[PDB]
Coordinates of N, CA and C (backbone and C1' of nucleotides) in Angstrom, one line a residue:
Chain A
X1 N 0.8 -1.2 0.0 CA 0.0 0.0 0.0 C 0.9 1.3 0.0
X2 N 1.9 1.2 0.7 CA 2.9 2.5 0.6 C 3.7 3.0 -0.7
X3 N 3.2 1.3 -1.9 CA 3.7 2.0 -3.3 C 2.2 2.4 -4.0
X4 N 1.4 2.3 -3.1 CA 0.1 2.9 -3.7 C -0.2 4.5 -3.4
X5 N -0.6 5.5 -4.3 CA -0.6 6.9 -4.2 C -1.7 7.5 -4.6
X6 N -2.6 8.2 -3.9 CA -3.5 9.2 -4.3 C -3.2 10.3 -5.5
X7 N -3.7 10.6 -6.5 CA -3.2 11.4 -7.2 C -4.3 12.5 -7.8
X8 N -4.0 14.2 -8.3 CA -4.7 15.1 -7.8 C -4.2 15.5 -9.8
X9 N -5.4 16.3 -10.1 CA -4.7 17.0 -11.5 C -4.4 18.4 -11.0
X10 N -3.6 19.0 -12.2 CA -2.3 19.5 -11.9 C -3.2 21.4 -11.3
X11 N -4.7 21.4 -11.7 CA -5.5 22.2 -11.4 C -6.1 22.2 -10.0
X12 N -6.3 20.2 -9.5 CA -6.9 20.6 -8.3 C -5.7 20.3 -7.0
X13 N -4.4 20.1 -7.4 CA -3.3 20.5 -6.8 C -2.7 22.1 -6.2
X14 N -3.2 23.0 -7.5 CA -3.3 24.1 -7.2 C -4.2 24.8 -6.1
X15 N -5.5 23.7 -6.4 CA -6.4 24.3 -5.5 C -6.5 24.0 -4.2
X16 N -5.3 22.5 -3.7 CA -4.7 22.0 -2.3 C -3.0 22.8 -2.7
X17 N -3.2 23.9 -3.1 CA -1.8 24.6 -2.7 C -0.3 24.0 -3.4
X18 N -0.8 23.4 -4.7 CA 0.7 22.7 -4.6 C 0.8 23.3 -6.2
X19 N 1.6 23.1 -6.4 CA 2.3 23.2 -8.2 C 3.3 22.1 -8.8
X20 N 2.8 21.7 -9.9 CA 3.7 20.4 -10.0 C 4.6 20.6 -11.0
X21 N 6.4 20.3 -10.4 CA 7.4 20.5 -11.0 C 7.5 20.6 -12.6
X22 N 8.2 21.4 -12.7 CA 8.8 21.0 -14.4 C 8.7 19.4 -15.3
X23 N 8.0 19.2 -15.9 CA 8.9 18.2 -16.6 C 8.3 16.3 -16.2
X24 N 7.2 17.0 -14.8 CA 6.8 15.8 -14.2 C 6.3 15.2 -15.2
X25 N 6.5 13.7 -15.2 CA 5.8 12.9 -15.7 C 4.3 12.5 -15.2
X26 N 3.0 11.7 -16.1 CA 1.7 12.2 -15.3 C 1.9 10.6 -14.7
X27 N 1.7 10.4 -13.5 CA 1.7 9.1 -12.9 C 0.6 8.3 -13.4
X28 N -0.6 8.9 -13.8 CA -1.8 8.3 -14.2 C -2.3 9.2 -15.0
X29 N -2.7 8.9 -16.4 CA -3.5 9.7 -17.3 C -4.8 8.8 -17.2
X30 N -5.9 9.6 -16.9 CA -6.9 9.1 -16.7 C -8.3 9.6 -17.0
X31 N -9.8 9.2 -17.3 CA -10.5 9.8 -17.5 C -10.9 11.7 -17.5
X32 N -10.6 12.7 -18.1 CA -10.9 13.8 -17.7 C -12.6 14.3 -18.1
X33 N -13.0 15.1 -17.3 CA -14.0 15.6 -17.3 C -14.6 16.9 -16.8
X34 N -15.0 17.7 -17.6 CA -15.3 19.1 -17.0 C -16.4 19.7 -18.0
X35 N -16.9 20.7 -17.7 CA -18.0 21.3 -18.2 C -17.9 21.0 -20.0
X36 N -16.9 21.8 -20.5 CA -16.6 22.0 -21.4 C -16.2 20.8 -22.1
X37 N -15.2 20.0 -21.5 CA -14.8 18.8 -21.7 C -15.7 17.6 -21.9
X38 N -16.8 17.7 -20.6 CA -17.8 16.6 -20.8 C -18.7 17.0 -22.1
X39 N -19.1 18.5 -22.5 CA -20.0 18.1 -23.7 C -19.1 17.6 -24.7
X40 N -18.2 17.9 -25.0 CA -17.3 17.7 -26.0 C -16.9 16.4 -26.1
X41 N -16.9 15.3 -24.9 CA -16.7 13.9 -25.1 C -18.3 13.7 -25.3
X42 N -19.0 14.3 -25.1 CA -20.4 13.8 -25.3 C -20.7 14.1 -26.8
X43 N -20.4 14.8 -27.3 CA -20.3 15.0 -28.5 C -19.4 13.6 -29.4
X44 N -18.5 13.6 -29.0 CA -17.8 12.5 -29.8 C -17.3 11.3 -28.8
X45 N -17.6 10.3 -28.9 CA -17.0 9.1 -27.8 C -15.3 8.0 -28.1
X46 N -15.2 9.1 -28.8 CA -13.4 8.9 -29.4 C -12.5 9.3 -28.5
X47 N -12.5 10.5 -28.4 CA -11.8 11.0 -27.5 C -12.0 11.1 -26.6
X48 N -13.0 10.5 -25.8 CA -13.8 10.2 -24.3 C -12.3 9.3 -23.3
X49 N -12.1 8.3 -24.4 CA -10.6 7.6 -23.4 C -9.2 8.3 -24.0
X50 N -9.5 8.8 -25.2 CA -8.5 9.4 -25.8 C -7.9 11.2 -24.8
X51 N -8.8 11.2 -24.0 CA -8.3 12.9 -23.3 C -7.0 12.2 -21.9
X52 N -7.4 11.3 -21.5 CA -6.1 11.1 -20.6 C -5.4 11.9 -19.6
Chain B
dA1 P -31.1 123.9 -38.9 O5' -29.9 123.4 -39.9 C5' -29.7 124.1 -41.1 C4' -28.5 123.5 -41.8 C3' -28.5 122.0 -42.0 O3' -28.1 121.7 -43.3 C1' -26.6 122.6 -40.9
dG2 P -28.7 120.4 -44.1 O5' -27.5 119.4 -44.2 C5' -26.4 119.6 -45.1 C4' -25.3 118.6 -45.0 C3' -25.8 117.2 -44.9 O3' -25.0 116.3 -45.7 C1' -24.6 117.7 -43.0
dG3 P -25.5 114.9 -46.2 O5' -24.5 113.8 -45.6 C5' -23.1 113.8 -45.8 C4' -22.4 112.8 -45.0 C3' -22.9 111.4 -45.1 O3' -21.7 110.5 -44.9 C1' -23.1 112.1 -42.9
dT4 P -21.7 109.1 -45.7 O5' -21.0 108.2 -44.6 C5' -19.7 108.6 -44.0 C4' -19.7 108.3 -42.5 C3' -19.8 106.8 -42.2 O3' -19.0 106.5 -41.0 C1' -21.6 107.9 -41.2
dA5 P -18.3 105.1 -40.8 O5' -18.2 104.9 -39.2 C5' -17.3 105.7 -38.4 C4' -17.8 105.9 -37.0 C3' -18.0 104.6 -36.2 O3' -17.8 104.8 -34.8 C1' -20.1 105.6 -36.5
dG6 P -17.6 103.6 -33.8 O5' -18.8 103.8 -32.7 C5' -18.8 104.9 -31.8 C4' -20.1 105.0 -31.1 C3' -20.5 103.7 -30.3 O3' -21.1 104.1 -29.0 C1' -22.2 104.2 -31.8
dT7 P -21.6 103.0 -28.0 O5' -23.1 102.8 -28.4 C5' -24.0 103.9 -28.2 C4' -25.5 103.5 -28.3 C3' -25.8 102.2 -27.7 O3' -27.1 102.3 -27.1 C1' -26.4 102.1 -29.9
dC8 P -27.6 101.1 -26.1 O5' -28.9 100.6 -26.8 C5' -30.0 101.5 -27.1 C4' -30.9 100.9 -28.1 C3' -31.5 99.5 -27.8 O3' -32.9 99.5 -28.2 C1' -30.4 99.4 -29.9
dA9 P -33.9 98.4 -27.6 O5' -34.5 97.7 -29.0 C5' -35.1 98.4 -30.0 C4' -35.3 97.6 -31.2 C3' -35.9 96.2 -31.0 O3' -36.8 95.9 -32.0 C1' -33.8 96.1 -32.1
dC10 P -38.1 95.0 -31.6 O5' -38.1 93.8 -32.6 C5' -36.9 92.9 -32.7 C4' -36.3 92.9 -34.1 C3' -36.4 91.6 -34.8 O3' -36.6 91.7 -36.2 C1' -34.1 92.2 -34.5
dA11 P -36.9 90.5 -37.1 O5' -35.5 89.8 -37.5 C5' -35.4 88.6 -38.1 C4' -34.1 88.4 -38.8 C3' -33.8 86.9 -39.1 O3' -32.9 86.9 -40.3 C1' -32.2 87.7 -37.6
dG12 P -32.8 85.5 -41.1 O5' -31.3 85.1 -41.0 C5' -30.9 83.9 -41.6 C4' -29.4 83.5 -41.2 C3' -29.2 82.0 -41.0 O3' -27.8 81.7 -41.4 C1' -28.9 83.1 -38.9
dC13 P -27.3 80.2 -41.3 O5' -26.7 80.1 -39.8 C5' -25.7 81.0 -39.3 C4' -24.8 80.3 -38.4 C3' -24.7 78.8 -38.6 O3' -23.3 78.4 -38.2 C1' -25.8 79.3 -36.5
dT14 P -23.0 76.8 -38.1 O5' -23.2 76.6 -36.5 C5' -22.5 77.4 -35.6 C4' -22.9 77.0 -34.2 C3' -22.8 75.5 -33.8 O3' -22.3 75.3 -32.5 C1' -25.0 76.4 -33.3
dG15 P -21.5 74.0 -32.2 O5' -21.8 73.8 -30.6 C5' -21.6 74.9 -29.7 C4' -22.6 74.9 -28.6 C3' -22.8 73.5 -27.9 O3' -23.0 73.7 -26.5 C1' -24.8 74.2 -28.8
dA16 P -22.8 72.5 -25.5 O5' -24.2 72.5 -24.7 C5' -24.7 73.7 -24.2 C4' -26.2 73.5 -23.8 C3' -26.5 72.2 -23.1 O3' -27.4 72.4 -22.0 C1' -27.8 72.4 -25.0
dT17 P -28.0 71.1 -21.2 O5' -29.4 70.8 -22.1 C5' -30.3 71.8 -22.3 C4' -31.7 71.2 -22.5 C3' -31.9 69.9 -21.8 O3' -33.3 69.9 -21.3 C1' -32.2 69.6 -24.2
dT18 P -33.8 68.6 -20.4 O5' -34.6 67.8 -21.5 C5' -35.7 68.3 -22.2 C4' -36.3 67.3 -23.1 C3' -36.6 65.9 -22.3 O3' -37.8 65.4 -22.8 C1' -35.2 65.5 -24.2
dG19 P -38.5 64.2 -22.0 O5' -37.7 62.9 -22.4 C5' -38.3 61.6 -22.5 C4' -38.7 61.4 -24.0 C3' -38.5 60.0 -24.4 O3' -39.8 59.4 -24.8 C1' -37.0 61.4 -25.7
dC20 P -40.1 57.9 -24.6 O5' -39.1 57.2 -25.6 C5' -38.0 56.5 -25.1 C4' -37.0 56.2 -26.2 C3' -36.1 55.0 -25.9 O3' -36.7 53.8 -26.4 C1' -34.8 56.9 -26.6
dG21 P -36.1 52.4 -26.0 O5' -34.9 52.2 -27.1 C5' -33.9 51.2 -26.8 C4' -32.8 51.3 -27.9 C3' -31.5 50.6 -27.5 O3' -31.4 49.4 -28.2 C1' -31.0 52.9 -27.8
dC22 P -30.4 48.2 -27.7 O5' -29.1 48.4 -28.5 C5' -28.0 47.6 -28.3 C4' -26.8 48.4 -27.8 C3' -25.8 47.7 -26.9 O3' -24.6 47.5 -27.5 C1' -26.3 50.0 -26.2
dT23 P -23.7 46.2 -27.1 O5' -22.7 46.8 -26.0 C5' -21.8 45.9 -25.3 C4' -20.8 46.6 -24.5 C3' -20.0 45.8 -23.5 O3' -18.8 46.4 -23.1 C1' -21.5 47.2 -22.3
dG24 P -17.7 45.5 -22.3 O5' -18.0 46.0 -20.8 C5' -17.3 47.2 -20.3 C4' -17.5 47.3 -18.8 C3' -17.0 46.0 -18.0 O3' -16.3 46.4 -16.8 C1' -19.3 46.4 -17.5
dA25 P -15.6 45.3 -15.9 O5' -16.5 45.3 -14.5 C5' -16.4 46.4 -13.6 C4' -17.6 46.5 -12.7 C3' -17.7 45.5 -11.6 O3' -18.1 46.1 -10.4 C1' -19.6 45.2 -12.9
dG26 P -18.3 45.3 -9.0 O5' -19.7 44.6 -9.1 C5' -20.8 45.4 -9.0 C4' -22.0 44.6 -8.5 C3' -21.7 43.5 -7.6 O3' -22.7 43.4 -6.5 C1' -22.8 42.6 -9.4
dG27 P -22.3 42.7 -5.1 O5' -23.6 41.8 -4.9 C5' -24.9 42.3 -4.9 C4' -25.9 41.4 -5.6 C3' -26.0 40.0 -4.9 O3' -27.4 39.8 -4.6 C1' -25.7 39.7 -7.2
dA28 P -27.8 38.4 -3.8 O5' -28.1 37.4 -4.9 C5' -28.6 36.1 -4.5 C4' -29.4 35.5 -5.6 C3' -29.2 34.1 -6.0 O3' -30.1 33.2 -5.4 C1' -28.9 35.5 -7.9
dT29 P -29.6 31.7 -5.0 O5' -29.6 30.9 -6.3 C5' -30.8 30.9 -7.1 C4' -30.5 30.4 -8.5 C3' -29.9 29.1 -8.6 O3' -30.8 28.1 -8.7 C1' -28.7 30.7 -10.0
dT30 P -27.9 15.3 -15.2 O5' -26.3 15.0 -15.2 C5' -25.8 14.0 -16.0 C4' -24.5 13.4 -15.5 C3' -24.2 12.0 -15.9 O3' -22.9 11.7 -15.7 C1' -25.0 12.2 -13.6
dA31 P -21.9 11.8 -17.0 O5' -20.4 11.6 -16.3 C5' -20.1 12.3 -15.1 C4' -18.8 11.7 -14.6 C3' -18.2 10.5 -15.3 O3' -16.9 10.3 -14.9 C1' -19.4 9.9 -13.3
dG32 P -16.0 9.3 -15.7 O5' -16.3 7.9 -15.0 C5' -15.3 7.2 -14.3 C4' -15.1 7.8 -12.9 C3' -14.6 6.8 -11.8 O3' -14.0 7.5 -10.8 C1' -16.8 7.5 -11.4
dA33 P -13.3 6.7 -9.6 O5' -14.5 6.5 -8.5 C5' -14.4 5.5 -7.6 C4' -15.4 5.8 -6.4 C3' -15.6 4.6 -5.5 O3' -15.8 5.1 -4.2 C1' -17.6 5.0 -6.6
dC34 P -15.5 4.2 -2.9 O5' -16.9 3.4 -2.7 C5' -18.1 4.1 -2.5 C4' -19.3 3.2 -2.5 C3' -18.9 1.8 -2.0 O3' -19.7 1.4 -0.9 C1' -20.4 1.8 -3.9
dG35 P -19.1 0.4 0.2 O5' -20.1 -0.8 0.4 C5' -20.2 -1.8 -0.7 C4' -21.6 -1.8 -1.3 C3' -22.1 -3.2 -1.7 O3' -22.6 -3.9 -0.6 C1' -22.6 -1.6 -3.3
dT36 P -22.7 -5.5 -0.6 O5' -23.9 -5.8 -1.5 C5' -25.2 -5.4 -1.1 C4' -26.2 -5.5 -2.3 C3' -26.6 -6.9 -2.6 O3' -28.0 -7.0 -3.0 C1' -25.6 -6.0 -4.5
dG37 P -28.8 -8.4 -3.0 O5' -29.0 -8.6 -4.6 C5' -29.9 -7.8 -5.4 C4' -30.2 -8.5 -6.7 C3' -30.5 -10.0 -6.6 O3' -31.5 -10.4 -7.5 C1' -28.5 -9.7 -7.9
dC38 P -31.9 -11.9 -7.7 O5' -31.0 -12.4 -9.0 C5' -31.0 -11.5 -10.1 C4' -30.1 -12.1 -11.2 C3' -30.1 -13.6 -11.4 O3' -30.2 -13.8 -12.8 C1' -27.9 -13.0 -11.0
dG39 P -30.5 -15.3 -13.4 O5' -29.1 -15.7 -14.1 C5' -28.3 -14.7 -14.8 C4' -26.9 -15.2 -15.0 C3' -26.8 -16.8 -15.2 O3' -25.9 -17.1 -16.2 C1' -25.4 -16.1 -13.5
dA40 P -26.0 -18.5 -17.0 O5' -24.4 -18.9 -17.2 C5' -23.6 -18.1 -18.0 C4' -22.2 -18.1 -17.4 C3' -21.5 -19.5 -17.5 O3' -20.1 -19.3 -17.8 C1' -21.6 -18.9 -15.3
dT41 P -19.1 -20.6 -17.8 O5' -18.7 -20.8 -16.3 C5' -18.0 -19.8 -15.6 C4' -17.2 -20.3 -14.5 C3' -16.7 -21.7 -14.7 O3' -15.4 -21.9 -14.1 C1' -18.0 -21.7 -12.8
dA42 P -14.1 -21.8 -15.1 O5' -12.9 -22.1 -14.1 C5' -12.9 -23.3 -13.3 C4' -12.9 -22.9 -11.8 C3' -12.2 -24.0 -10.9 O3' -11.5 -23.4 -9.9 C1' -14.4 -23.7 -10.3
dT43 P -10.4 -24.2 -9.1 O5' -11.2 -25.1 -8.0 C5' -12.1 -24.4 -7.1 C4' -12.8 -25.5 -6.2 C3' -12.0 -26.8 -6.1 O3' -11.8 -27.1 -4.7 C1' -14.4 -27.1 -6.5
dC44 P -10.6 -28.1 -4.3 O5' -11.4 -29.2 -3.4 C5' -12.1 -28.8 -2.3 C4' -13.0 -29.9 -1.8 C3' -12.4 -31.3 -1.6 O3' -12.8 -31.8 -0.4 C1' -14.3 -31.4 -3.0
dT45 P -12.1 -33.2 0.1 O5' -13.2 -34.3 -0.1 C5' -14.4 -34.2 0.5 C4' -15.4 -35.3 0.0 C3' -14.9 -36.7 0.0 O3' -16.0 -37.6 0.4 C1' -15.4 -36.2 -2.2
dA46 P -15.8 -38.9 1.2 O5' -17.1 -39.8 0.9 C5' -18.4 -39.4 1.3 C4' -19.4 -40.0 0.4 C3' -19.5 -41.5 0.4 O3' -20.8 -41.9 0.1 C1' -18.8 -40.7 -1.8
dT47 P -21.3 -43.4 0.5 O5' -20.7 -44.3 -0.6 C5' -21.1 -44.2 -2.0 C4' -20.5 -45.2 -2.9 C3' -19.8 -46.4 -2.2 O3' -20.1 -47.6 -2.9 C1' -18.2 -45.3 -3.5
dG48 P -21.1 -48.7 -2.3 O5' -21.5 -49.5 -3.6 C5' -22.1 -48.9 -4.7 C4' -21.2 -49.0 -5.9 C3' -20.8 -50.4 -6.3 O3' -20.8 -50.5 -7.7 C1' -18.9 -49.0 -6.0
dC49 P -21.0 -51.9 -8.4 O5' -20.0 -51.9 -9.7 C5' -20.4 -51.1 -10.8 C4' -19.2 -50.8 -11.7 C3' -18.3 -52.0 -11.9 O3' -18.7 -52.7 -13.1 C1' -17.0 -50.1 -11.2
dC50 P -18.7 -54.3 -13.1 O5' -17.1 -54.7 -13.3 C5' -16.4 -54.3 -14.4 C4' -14.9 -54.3 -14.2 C3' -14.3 -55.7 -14.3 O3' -13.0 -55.6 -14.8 C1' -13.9 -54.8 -12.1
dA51 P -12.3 -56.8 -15.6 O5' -10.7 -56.7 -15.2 C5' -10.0 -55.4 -15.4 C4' -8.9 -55.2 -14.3 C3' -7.8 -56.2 -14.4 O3' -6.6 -55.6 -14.1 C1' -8.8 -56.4 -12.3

DNA sequence: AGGTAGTCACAGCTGATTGCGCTGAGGATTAGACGTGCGATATCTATGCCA
């Protein structure tokens, strides 16, 4: 469990006070979703796993 | 006594006025999780088959 990690995007990191380094690599690219984003995967179901 | 400049009484030009339109700030407003229900599926052992 101690190699297992909670992980935040790089917007709601900002919003828990943090900024993530230069260069980081994304530990998990993973479903995204947001106003804008959800109609737009609603719109097309390609890029629904394709946003990462 | 004589005529055109100073003074007063009216005219054109233009700015302020009064209906009405438009932006900028300001205060209102179901998608992975978490489980289970159902269904396909590994799973353990009785016990009598005849060599």
């Amino acid at each position: 469990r101690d190699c297992v990690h909670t992980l935040h995007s790089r917007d709601t990191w900002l919003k828990k006070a943090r900024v993530v380094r230069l260069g980081e690599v994304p530990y998990k690219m993973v479903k995204g979703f947001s106003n804008r984003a959800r109609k737009a995967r609603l719109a097309e179901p390609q890029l629904r796993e394709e946003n990462d």
